[PDB]
Scaffold this active site. Structure first.
Site: not given
Ligand SMILES: *[C@](O)(C(=O)NC)[C@H](C[C@@H]1CCNC1=O)NC(=O)[C@H](CC1CC1)n1cccc(NC(=O)OC(C)(C)C)c1=O
Ligand SMILES: *[C@](O)(C(=O)NC)[C@H](C[C@H]1CCNC1=O)NC(=O)[C@H](CC1CC1)n1cccc(NC(=O)OC(C)(C)C)c1=O
Ligand SMILES: [Cl-]
Lengths: 306, 306
Positions: A41, A143, A145
């Site tokens: 992603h 950040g 991930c």
């Molecule tokens: C990851 O992509 C990243 O660090 N990108 C720069 C993040 C890491 C998470 C966000 C903060 N806490 C984490 O562990 N992951 C995502 O944003 C993830 C990407 C998806 C392909 C897997 N992601 C996307 C959309 C929604 C969510 N979940 C979410 O919003 O959960 C709640 C609890 C409703 C907020 C998600 O993890």
């Protein structure tokens, strides 16, 4: 003596941590030899992520679109490849600091250390168990991930986890390093939920053994249970059924303390039924289930790493 | 999402861990530039340690009586001095892996990461706190001595602790890296008692903000308190006095949450009085006092090291 939640020493993993940037998205890669492993992603944008066609978006990407960074050094990307949910970025330089390593898929109940990173930079390290429902209770911000989970058996790094998503309840999901999710989760914006968790019984007994080795023994009793009668109780409280294999796995600590599994099991039945009655065990006011048999043996017999 | 007892990445300290042997005694050394620091009780036999004259004992040792090992490679000792309770062994080689570093003496309530070592091999890493009685609740077996405590401020490693002894109830004492002990302890095999521990109030409050930042709200009440009214209640539950500087230091977290410090104090005051009545906070059934205000900001705002 003493007993702490203990991460592995993280240095061999710090050596592998890089920054990967595609357009607006920046996160962490794992740099082993001339390959950088990062969540697939990284490639897509906030949009699509509804339901993104990774095969299709990858065709469009140019190696130039991946800005990979090891401290103050851009690494030339020369090839891109997808395994399940992980991106593989071939780069024109093998990692001088590549340690001996394996990619393993851990079973639920098993524990690893997490090195939390941001912009390829490590923030901190902490121990955490793969729950029976294939979530982990981490500490992950945007950040984070691409941050990874690992065990160190001697000098060999066993990589078992790469970070992908948070879930409602503040729990985390991710993949092995072949890019398969633990649990039924998917790399989308699609709404998702853990499923009911269970208590890792084998681990609770381990910790009880840990407390006894460390002088904390107030809860030891002259009473005994059968395995069956013990499960009839603990199962009512959402604890994992305890099996003969579990009891065998507890063999070493049973022997070290001189207390038999089915004796400790009567201490555990009682603590569930009457609660802790205002007392603590290893300074915890509930029953910690994120230490394995081996974790106790390690910390309490003091086995070293390198 | 999630909150966790989180150690600093240990990479930069691992590259400074040596083994030091003097006759029949082996422990850990800290190797920075051309000097190895260890506890001075490495020159003792198990009979000297009841009431030793370390000055006398050191006079009766040559450079060659110190076998210092860095991996396979032995290091030639070319000098030895004793500063308070630590031995400074001048060696012929400067540690290529020597980070930018300094020696600090921390205050009670301040936290640091411990890299538990056996035979100059790093084994585990865990966060803990200089308790108000000048002990640390660590995890330490025989061979652990010379293991250090440390923070990272960006890229500067601050060394704050070296491990020396175990005291009653499985708590630990040691020195700063100038060999001065934290608390009234001595480098001796004598009956020593730690003194009654109290809870680190400013830290519990910091963690209540963390609870609130991670969506744990239930313990917020509709009341405020004076500092004086708060101390009257806290005194009677073995809580360290909360001072005007503790309130001021808690400001940034107050501003991030929109919850006035003295309103958070009033919620804590209620928790001490009625207890928690079976409820948890960040998955703890007791109040955590081993996160500083800065630790909570560190982890919630995700600050990073290199
Ligand atoms: C990851 O992509 C990243 O660090 N990108 C720069 C993040 C890491 C998470 C966000 C903060 N806490 C984490 O562990 N992951 C995502 O944003 C993830 C990407 C998806 C392909 C897997 N992601 C996307 C959309 C929604 C969510 N979940 C979410 O919003 O959960 C709640 C609890 C409703 C907020 C998600 O993890
Ligand atoms: C340390 O010297 C070492 O690792 N050397 C190889 C060791 C640290 C270990 C031992 C068990 N737990 C630890 O933290 N320390 C000691 O053994 C010290 C030596 C200090 C110079 C005086 N030491 C020696 C004798 C007795 C004790 N403590 C002791 O008797 O503990 C009770 C019984 C709890 C009071 C001690 O720490
Ligand atoms: Cl608890």
């Amino acid at each position: 003596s003493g007993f702490r939640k203990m991460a592995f020493p993280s240095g061999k993993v710090e050596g592998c941590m890089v920054q990967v940037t595609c357009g607006t998205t920046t996160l962490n890669g794992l740099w082993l030899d001339d390959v950088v492993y990062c969540p697939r992603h990284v490639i897509c944008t906030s949009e699509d992520m509804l339901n993104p066609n990774y095969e299709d978006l990858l065709i469009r990407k140019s190696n130039h679109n991946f800005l990979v960074q090891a401290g103050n050094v851009q690494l030339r990307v020369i090839g891109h490849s997808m395994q399940n949910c992980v991106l593989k970025l071939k780069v024109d330089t093998a990692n001088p600091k590549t340690p001996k390593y394996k990619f393993v898929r851990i079973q639920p109940g098993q524990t690893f250390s997490v090195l939390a990173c941001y912009n390829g930079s490590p923030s901190g390290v902490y121990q955490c168990a793969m729950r029976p429902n294939f979530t982990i209770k981490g500490s992950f911000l945007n950040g984070s991930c691409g941050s990874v989970g690992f065990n160190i058996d001697y000098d060999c790094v066993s990589f078992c986890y790469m970070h992908h998503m948070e879930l409602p309840t503040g729990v985390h999901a991710g993949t092995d390093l072949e890019g398969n999710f633990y649990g039924p989760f998917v790399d989308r914006q699609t709404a998702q939920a853990a499923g009911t968790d269970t208590t890792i019984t084998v681990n609770v007994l381990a910790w009880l053994y840990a407390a006894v080795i460390n002088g904390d023994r107030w809860f030891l009793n002259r009473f005994t249970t059968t395995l069956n009668d013990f499960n009839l109780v603990a199962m009512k409280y959402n604890y994992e059924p305890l099996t003969q294999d579990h009891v065998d796995i507890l063999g070493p600590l049973s022997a070290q303390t001189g207390i038999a599994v089915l004796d400790m099991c009567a201490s555990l039945k009682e603590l569930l039924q009457n609660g802790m009655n205002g007392r603590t065990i290893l300074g915890s006011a509930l029953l910690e289930d994120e230490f394995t048999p081996f974790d106790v043996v390690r910390q309490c017999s003091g086995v070293t790493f390198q």
